[PDB]
Amino acid sequence: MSNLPVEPEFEQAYKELASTLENSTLFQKNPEYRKALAVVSVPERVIQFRVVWENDKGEVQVNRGFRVQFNSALGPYKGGLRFHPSVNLSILKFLGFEQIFKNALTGLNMGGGKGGSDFDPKGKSDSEIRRFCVAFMTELCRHIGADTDVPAGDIGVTGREIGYLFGQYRKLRNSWEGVLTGKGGSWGGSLIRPEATGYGVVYYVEHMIAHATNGAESFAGKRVAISGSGNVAQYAALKVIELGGRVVSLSDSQGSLIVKDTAKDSFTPAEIDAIAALKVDRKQIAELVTDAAFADKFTYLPGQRPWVHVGAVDVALPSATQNEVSGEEAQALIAAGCKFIAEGSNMGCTQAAIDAFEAHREANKGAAAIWYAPGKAANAGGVAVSGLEMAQNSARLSWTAEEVDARLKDIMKSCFQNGLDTAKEYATPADGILPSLVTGSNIAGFTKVAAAMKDQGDWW
Amino acid sequence: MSNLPVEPEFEQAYKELASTLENSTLFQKNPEYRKALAVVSVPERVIQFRVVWENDKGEVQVNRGFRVQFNSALGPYKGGLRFHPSVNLSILKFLGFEQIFKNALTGLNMGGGKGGSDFDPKGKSDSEIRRFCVAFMTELCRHIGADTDVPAGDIGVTGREIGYLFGQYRKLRNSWEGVLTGKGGSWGGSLIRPEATGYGVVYYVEHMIAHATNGAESFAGKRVAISGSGNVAQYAALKVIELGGRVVSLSDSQGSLIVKDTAKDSFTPAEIDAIAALKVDRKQIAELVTDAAFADKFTYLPGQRPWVHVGAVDVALPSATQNEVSGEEAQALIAAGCKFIAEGSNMGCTQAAIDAFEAHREANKGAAAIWYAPGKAANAGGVAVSGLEMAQNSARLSWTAEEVDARLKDIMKSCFQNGLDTAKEYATPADGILPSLVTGSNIAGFTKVAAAMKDQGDWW
Amino acid sequence: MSNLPVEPEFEQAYKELASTLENSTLFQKNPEYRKALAVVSVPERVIQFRVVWENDKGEVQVNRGFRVQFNSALGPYKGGLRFHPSVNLSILKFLGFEQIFKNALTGLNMGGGKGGSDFDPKGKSDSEIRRFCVAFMTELCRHIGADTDVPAGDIGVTGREIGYLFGQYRKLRNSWEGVLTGKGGSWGGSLIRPEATGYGVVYYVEHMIAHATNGAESFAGKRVAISGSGNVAQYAALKVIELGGRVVSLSDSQGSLIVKDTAKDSFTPAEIDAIAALKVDRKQIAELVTDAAFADKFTYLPGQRPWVHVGAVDVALPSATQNEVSGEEAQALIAAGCKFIAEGSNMGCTQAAIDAFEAHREANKGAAAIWYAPGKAANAGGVAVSGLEMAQNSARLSWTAEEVDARLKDIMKSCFQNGLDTAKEYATPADGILPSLVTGSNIAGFTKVAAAMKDQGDWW
Amino acid sequence: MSNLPVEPEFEQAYKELASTLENSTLFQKNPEYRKALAVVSVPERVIQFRVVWENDKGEVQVNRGFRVQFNSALGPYKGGLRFHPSVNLSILKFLGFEQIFKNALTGLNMGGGKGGSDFDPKGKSDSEIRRFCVAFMTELCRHIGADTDVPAGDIGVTGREIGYLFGQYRKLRNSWEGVLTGKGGSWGGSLIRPEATGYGVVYYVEHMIAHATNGAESFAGKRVAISGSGNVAQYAALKVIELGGRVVSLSDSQGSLIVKDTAKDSFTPAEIDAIAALKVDRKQIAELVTDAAFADKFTYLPGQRPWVHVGAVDVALPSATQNEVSGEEAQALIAAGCKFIAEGSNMGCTQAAIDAFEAHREANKGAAAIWYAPGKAANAGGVAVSGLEMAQNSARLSWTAEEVDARLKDIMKSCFQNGLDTAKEYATPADGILPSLVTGSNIAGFTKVAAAMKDQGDWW
C-alpha cells in the first residue's frame, strides 16, 4: 500500500485509534473487528471540485472545494464546512474521522463528514464572500441533499456564509428544505443554535472535567489554562468562572496572556467579553495589554504557548488548534502538578504528549495520577444541536429554547453515560491506577460503528 | 418599463405599499432598502399553462392555469388555488403579494404565492369538475412539488376539487405526500382545517377591531357592518354576536340586506346559517327577504352597498370583494360616525377611501378618530392552519383538534399582538393620535422580508 | 373573455390568421377545424422569471426572463432567444406563434416557441453580459432540457451570449449536450450556420420573389427597396446583386439611406460591407454620408423611411422591424407601380396595408397586379440550419459544410414546393389572377398543425 | 498553496507544459492567457470512493475507485479506466491532463478525464473480476451518464471488465445506452475498436516519425528501438516491419530482448506475435529466450533496458511506461547517433532527457539535429476511434469497418498530419534549424482549450 499519499494528521489520528484498540483485549474477544477497522479507515466518498469566482477588481480566482463523506452507517452525512486557507484533504479526512466517533458516542444518529475550501475569509469584502459562496454552492449542490449531505458551520463559516449558501441552494434546487446547518431564525433556524454552536464544546469540556474530578475537590480553587481564544475558549473560561474556578493563562493564536497574580486573581468576564469583541473584529489580544485593563493585570508573550509557563496549575483545557501540546508541554504540566488534562479541540495534543500522560498516569497508583480526556468525549454539543435543527426543519415546526436545551441535556448525559458504561465494560476500572478514559471513548465509538456496519453489510 | 403591461390591482397594491414606505422615515434610516423594493416587486416565477378538458357532450374546452410564485425568502411557495372566471395574471400577482406580507407579519415561515384558473365552477357537474381537475393537475404537477409549491383552497376550490387534484397528483408523482393544502381527514388531513381557515380569518378581523378599540367600549353596543356573505362574512357576524355585537347590514354580491330596526334588532344565528346554506347552494339572499322572517326583520336593496344605507354605525367589516369601499362610502361611514374601519378581504377599500380615512384620522386628533386596519393584519389564520396541516403531513402523524387550536392560538397571538405592537411602535404615533395600523403593518412585513432576502443574498 | 390582457402584436397576428382562414372555404369543407384554432391560440406553457444580476459598480439589477413554449405538436420546443429592451410577453407570444407555422411549412419537426429577456445589450461591458447570462441560465435551466426546449440566437443574442449561456448550462446540468443552438464549432457547432442564420432568410426572400415572378421578367432591371439593415438586409442586397438587381435604398433604425440615382446607380458590396461593419460596431449609417464615396452617392434622411420616396420601384423587401409598412406607404408604393411586395421579417406590414394590397390584387385581372408575400413563407432557412445543428449534436458528428448546405437546399426547396403547392391548391386561383401567397401559406401551416394535433389528441 | 499535496507525475507534466509556454512568445502576444493556465490546472471534479467486495474465500477486500474529470470545455468527460495496483490520484490527474490536450489536437469534441482503481487484476479469478466490477459500478454509477462521463478501457481493463461493468450499469440505471467505451459487437460495440485502440496508437507513433523524416530517407534502413511490449509496441514493430524498418530491441517490463545481429538481422513478425501470445498469457519474455528460436536470435538482459545497449541505432520508440527514458539513456542514444525519437506513451522520457534532446537539437544546425516528439501528437489515435464510438450507440445504428476506418483516417490526418503542420506553423521554423515539435503541439493544444474555455466563460 505504498501508492497512498502522506496525510500526516489523518495518519496520526488513525494510528492513535489503532494503537488504543490494540492496547485493550478487544481484538482478543472479537478478532473479527480487525477487518472492520480496515473498512472504516477508507472514506465512503470524497468530492473535490474547482470553484472559480471573481473578486472586486474583476480578476479570476480559482479555489478548490471539498466534501468528505466518511461514513453513513449510523445516519446521514451531516457534517460541517470549514473555509480556511490551510484546508486540504488530509485535515478534512482527519476531522471527518473524528466526527464519526463523536457522533457514535453522543448516541445521536448522524454520519461522519466534513467539507470546506481553501477560501481565505480574512480580508474579503461582503461581495467577495457572496460571490464565492454562490460559486461554491453551484459546484456542490449535486452532491448534497436534505437527507443525503447536510453541511454546517465551522472556522471561517458564519451566519453570513451560511445565508449566502442557502440562498444559492434554494435558487438551484428550487426546493426550500433543510439541507445545511446554521440558518437564521427567519428561514428554518433553531433556537440555542448560535449559543450552542459557540457553547456546546464549552459545556462538554466543563462537565467532562467535573465528572473526571470524581465529585470531590471540584473546579473551585484549581488553576485552569484555556489555550486559544473565541468561540469555545471564551465561554469555557466563563463557565469555569461560574463554577468557582479561575482563568489563569488564556491565550490566542498569535501569543499568550498570563495574569501576574496567577494564584489570587483571574480573567474577569468583562475582559473575556472584550476579547470576544476583538476576535469578532479580527484583532489580536496583544492590543489589550496596551490598555491599562491588562497592562497591570496580564503579561503578553509573543509566540509563546501558556503550557511552559503556567505556574503550578492543576487543570488544562487546550482548545486552540491541533497539535497545540507536545511532550515538553506535558513535562511543564507535570512539573506544575497538573492532574486533569482535557482537550477542547480535535487532536489537541501530540502523540508524544499522550504517551507522557499515559506513563505518568500508570506511575501514580492513586488519585494523584494525571488523567487525559480525548477531544471526542469533549466538544460534541454542536453536533447534537445541528441534529436538533435538522429534525425541526424536517418537521416544519420551530421549537422553543427550553425544549432544545432539554434535548441537549439528555444527549450530553447520554454521551457521558455511554462513555462511562464502555469504561466499565472494556477499560475495566479498579481502585489504584486510574483507567484510561481515552481508551473507553475510543472503544465505545469504534464498537458502536463497527456493529452498525456489520449489521448493514459494510463488512462481514 | 414601457414594455411592462398594465395590471390595475397589482399596480394599486404596489403603489400603496411604496407610498406607505416612503411616508415613514424607513428609507431615511435605511436607504439601502430602496433596492429591496425593486427586487420584491418582481415574482420569482410565473407559470401559465393551457388546460384542455372535455365537458359532458364530448366538446373540447380550453382554459388557462396559473401558478404565481412570488417570493420564497421566508419559506416554501405554499399558496392557494382560486378557480374563478375572473382570474388573470394581475389578480393572482396581487394576491401573491399580499400573501408574502401576511406571512411576514405572521411569524410563520411560509412564502408568498398563489395559483388558480379561469375555470367557472358554477353550473358544472361533478364529472366536469373531475375532468378539469385531472387536466389541471396533469399540467401543473411538474412545477409544484412536495415542498416546492404547496397549493391550497380558495374561492371556487372546495374540498371536492382538492380531492380530485390530490388523486391525480398521487397518480402522476406516484408518491403519496403532503403537496397541497385542504385534504380531507381520511387522507393526510388536519382537524377543522377548512373550518379552521375560515374561522381564523374571522377571528383575526374581530380581535383586531377589539384591540383597535383600545379595550374599552368594545363590539357590544357599537353597530357593525358586514359586506358579503359566506365564510368570512358569516362567521364574522357569528363571532360579533358572541361578543355582544349587533349585526346590521349582512350583504351579498348581487344586492344588500339591511335590518329595518338597525338599532334595536340584529341578525339571529339561524338566519345567518340559512344564508350559509343558500350560499353553498349557489343562491341569492333575495330569496330569504320573500320569507316572513326576513320580511319582518330586514329590507332588501338591489345592487346597493350597505355603507350608505346602514344607519349611523360605528364599525364596519368589508369582506365581499376588492375595491368594495370607495371615497363616497368613506363619506357615508364618517357621517355615520364609523370610528373603526377594517376589511376582512384584500384591498377591500378603494384608494380614495384610504386617503379619506387617513385624512380623518389626522385632522380629528384624539380617541375620536377613524382608524383604518389593513387587510394583511386581518384575515390570516387560514395560512397558519395550512402550515399546521403541512407540518402534520410531513410528520405523518395527525394531531388533535385541541393541539391544533392551541398552536393556532399561539400563532395568531404572535402575528396579531405583532400587528398591534408594530402599529403602536413602528408608526411611533403621537399620544391621542391613533397609531396608523396600515403604516405599522406595511413597514413590519416589508422590513422582515427585506432583511431575510438581504442575508440570503437576493439583493445587496 | 374580458379578463385577458391586451397584447396588440399577438392579437393582430391571430386576427390576420383567423381572417385568412375564414376567407377560404376551409371551414365549409372541414367545419371541425373551427375548434382547433381555439386550442392552437393558447400557448402550451409560458414561464416568466426574475433575473437578478450585478453590474461593475456593484449594484443589484433586476430583469425579467421569459420562455414561451407555444406548441410542440410537430416536434420539440426549439425556439430562440431575443435580448431586447422592448421584449415583453406580447411580442414573444407573437414571435412564437409565427414560429409554429414557419416550422410547419419547412417540413421539419421543430415546434413553435421563443424566449428572451428585457436585457439591453447596448452599453453593457463583457463582464455585464457574462453575469447576466449566468443568472439567466441559472433561472432557466430547469425549464429547458436537452430535448424539451432548445433555444437559439436572435436580436441581442450573438455568439458571445450563446457561449456564456452554454458555459453556465454545462455547469448546472453537469451534462454536455446539445441543449441550445448557436455554439462555436469547437464545442459542437455547425457549418453553414454563423452566416446562414441570416443568409437563409435572404435566400428565402429572393428565391420566393423569383418564383413569384412566374419564371420571367426576373430580378434584373427592377428597382428594389430593402428597408433596414443587419444580418438580413445586407446579404439580401448582396444576393439581389448576384441576381442582376440594383439595390436602391437600404434604411436603418434611425432613418434611411437612399442612392440619388435610383435607375443608373446601385449599392456596391464594399459599401454594404461597410454598413455591416458599422452595424456590428453598433454605429449609425448617418455618419457615412460624410465620407465622399457615400456623400456623392447616398443621402441620409432623419426619421424617414424609403417607401414614400424611392420612386417608381417594382420590388420591395421590408426587413427592418414589425409594423414597418402602413397603408399610406402602401399607397405610395402603388403610386410607384410596385408589383411585388414581400416581407423580410415578421408582420412587416400593417393590416391596413394588407387590405390595400389584397384590394389592389383583386382589382387587376391579369399579371399586372401587386402581390404580397407572407413573412412565414420568407425568412425560414435559419430555423432549418438550427435543426440541422441539433441533429449534428445528437449524433455527435460534425458534418461537412457541403453536406449541411445540400440538406439545407433540400429543405428550402421542399418548403418552397409546399408553399407554391398550397398556393395553387387551396387558394385555387384562376388563369391570370395570381395564387395569393398569404392565403396559401396560412392555410397550409394551420392545416398541417391542426391535423398533427388532432391525431395526437390535443382536440377532439 | 503550501497545503497542496505533492504529486510528482502531475507536477512534472504541468511544469513541462508551463515551461514550454514560457519558452515561446505566447504570453507576450496574448498575456491574458497567463491566467487560463491557473484554471486548466485544477480538475473540474475528482471523485474517490470505497469499493468493498468479496474474494473466493469469503473474506472482505477494500479498494479505492477514482474518477477524475479534468476538463469539459471541448466536450463530455469521455475518458478511460485503468485497474492497476499503482493507481493513485497523482497518476490519474496526470493522465487526464494529457488527455485534455490529446483530444484538443485530435480535433474531436472530447473532454479530459480518467478513472480507475487500485485493483490488481493479476491473480484474480473470473469471479473476483466480476464481483469487483459490480461493486465498482455500484459505487460509480451515479457520477456518470451517457453524455456526462463515458469511461473506456486501459491497462488492466479489457473486454471482460468492460462487459461486467456494462452489465451492472444497465441493471442499476435500467436504461440501456452507450455510457462507456469498449463494449462488444453484440451490445452497442464498434468495429475496428478492439484493434483500433492499440492499432491507432501504433499508427500515430510510427507515421509521426515517418513525417518527421521530412519525406526522405524513411523508416527503411534505420534501426528502431521498441521499449516495452503489448497492445502498442507489438503492432508498432509489426507495421515498422511493414513500412520496411528493422525491429532490433523489442523489449518488455522485467527485462530486455535484443537481437544479437542488431544491424543485418531483425525481429521476425511472427516473433512479435509470440510476444503478444505470452503477454496475453501473463508470462515473461525471458521464457521465450529459453526457446531456441530466441536463444540463437536474441540476448536477454535482466533488469536492463535497450537504450544503453542499442548498438548505434537511429530511431527510438519508447512505449513501455512513464519515465522509461533518463538523461543517461539519452546520452547513450546520442552516442548511438540516434536522430529521431518519439514516445509511444505519456512522458516516456524524463525531464533531464528532454533537456538533453533540446540541447542537442539546438547545437546542430541542419538535419543532423535530434528531434524529440511529444507523446500527445504520438500515442493518441485510439482515442479517435474511442470517440468514434457512442455515436453509433446514440444513433442506434452500427457502421461497417470501412466507414469507421475512413472516419479514423480523416481524424488521424487532421490530428497527426496537422500536428506536424502545427510544428511547421506555430513553432515558426526556418530553413536548416529544426523547430520544436513538442513546443508546437503543446502550444496548439493549450491555445485551443484556452480559447474554448474563455468563450464558454470558465475564465476571463
CA-derived radius of gyration, chain D = 22
DSSP string for C106-157 = TTS---EEEEEES---TT--HHHHHHHHHHHHHHHTTT--SSS-----BTTB
B246 has binding-site annotation? no
| Amino acid code (one letter) for D376 | K
A125 touching B, CB under 8 A? no
Experimental method: cryo-EM
Distance from CA of A61 to the nearest CA of C (A): 15
* Rounded (5°) CA angle C106-C109-C113: 90
By C-alpha distance, the chain C residue nearest A135 is C171
Picking from C164, C184, C188, the nearest residue to D457 by CB comes out as C164
All cell numbers assigned to A181: 446547518
B376 has binding-site annotation? no
A177 touching B, CB under 8 A? yes
Residue indicated by cell numbers 441533429? C391
Catalytic residue among C93, C114, C183, C448: C114
Catalytic residue among D114, D183, D222, D376: D114
Annotated binding residues of A, written as ranges, equal: 78, 80, 82, 84, 99, 102, 114, 122, 153-154, 156, 193, 197, 229, 231-232, 253, 279, 284, 346, 386
- Residue D99 DSSP symbol: H
In 3D space, the residue among B433, B409, B431, B435 whose CA is nearest the CA of residue B422 turns out to be B435
Spell out the alpha helix ranges (H) of B281-381. 286-290, 292-297, 327-335, 351-363
| Amino acid code (one letter) for C321 | T
Report d(CA A42, CA A39) in Å as an integer: 6
Cβ of C35 and B59 within 8 Å?
Answer: yes
D394 touching C, CB under 8 A? yes
Cβ of D44 and A48 within 8 Å?
Answer: no
Going from the C-alpha of C141 to that of each of A242, B77, C62, C183, the distances in angstroms are: 56, 19, 18, 17
CB D206 within 8 A of CB D319: no
Distance from CA of C65 to the nearest CA of D (A): 20
D395 touching C, CB under 8 A? yes
Q: Which residues of A touch D44 (CB under 8 A)?
A: 49-50
D455 touching C, CB under 8 A? yes
What is the set of active-site residues of B?
Answer: 114
In 3D space, the residue among A168, A161, A154, A162 whose CA is nearest the CA of residue A198 turns out to be A154
Going from the C-alpha of A337 to that of each of A357, B113, C280, D365, the distances in angstroms are: 12, 67, 83, 80
Cβ of B48 and C49 within 8 Å?
Answer: no
The enclosing H or E element of D61 equals strand D60-71
Using DSSP, state whether A373 is helix, strand or coil: strand
Annotated binding residues of C for NAD(+), written as ranges, equal: 197, 231
Report d(CA C40, CA B62) in Å as an integer: 10
Report d(CA A41, CA A36) in Å as an integer: 9
Report d(CA C198, CA C196) in Å as an integer: 5
Report d(CA D137, CA A175) in Å as an integer: 30
Touching subunits of B (3+ CB pairs, under 8 Å) are A, C
C114 in active site: yes
Going from the C-alpha of B292 to that of each of B251, B298, B303, D277, the distances in angstroms are: 18, 10, 22, 111
| Amino acid code (one letter) for D425 | E
3-state helix, strand, coil in chain A (%, to 5): 45, 15, 40
The enclosing H or E element of B135 equals helix B126-140
Mutate to test the interface with D, among A2, A33, A42, A144 (most CBs of D within 10 A): A42
Cβ of B455 and A397 within 8 Å?
Answer: no
CA A177 to chain CA mean position, Å: 27
Q: What is the resolution of this structure in A?
A: 3.2
CB A419 within 8 A of CB A444: yes
Cβ of B457 and A130 within 8 Å?
Answer: yes
C396 touching B, CB under 8 A? no
B360 touching A, CB under 8 A? no
B281 touching A, CB under 8 A? no
Cβ of D48 and A44 within 8 Å?
Answer: no
Strand partners, B318: B227
B227 has binding-site annotation? no
* Rounded (5°) CA angle A28-A33-A39: 150
Cβ of A395 and B391 within 8 Å?
Answer: yes
Cβ of D50 and A35 within 8 Å?
Answer: no
Please, which contacts does B359-365 make with residues 24 or more away whose CB atoms are closer than 8 Å? B360/B330, B360/B334, B361/B433, B361/B434, B361/B436, B362/B433, B365/B430, B365/B432, B365/B433
In 3D space, the residue among B232, B168, B156, B159 whose CA is nearest the CA of residue B190 turns out to be B159
Phi, psi of B212, deg, nearest 5: -85, -15
Cβ of A39 and D49 within 8 Å?
Answer: no
D448 touching C, CB under 8 A? yes
Report d(CA D438, CA D457) in Å as an integer: 28
Cβ of B456 and A126 within 8 Å?
Answer: no
Buried b (16+ CB within 10 A) or exposed e, C280-312: eeeeebeebbeeeebeebbebbeeebbbbebbe
The enclosing H or E element of B372 equals strand B372-373
Strand partners, A116: A66, A82
Strand pairing category for B60-71 and B112-117: antiparallel
Report d(CA D202, CA D208) in Å as an integer: 10
Mutate to test the interface with A, among D42, D93, D141 (most CBs of A within 10 A): D42
D458 touching C, CB under 8 A? yes
Picking from B75, B394, B455, the nearest residue to A184 by CB comes out as B455
B229 has binding-site annotation? yes
Which residues, in sequence order, are CB contacts of A115 under 8 Å at separation 6+?
A: A65, A66, A67, A68, A79, A80, A81, A82, A92, A140, A151
Going from the C-alpha of A458 to that of each of A35, A45, A143, C269, D51, the distances in angstroms are: 11, 14, 21, 75, 10
Picking from A56, A58, A142, the nearest residue to C174 by CB comes out as A142
By C-alpha distance, the chain A residue nearest B143 is A174
A118 touching D, CB under 8 A? yes
Which residues, in sequence order, are CB contacts of A285 under 8 Å at separation 6+?
A: A229, A251, A252, A254, A255, A257, A275, A278, A279, A300
Q: Which C residues, 232 through 251, put their C-beta within 8 Å of a C-beta on chain D? A: none
The enclosing H or E element of A361 equals helix A351-363
C191 touching D, CB under 8 A? no
Mutate to test the interface with C, among A50, A171, A173, A175 (most CBs of C within 10 A): A171
HEC string of C296-333 equals CCEEEEECCCHHHCCCCCCEECCCCCCCCCCHHHHHHH
Can you say whether the dihedral through the CA atoms of D442, D447, D452, D458 is positive or negative?
positive
Mutate to test the interface with C, among B2, B14, B33, B60 (most CBs of C within 10 A): B60
Picking from A56, A58, A138, the nearest residue to C171 by CB comes out as A138
Report d(CA C296, CA A41) in Å as an integer: 85
Cβ of A39 and D60 within 8 Å?
Answer: yes
CB B391 within 8 A of CB B404: no
D459 touching A, CB under 8 A? yes
Going from the C-alpha of B266 to that of each of B272, B296, B297, C53, C317, the distances in angstroms are: 11, 12, 8, 59, 76
Strand partners, C57: none
CB D117 within 8 A of CB D89: no
Residue indicated by cell numbers 410577453? C89
Q: Which B residues, 52 through 81, put their C-beta within 8 Å of a C-beta on chain C? A: 52, 54, 58-60, 62, 64
By C-alpha distance, the chain D residue nearest A143 is D143
Architecture of domain B195-377: 3-Layer(aba) Sandwich (3.40)
Going from the C-alpha of B277 to that of each of B73, B234, B268, the distances in angstroms are: 40, 11, 15
The enclosing H or E element of C225 equals strand C223-226
Strand partners, C113: C69
Q: Which residues of C touch A139 (CB under 8 A)?
A: 171
Distance from CA of A185 to the nearest CA of B (A): 9
Cβ of C142 and A174 within 8 Å?
Answer: yes
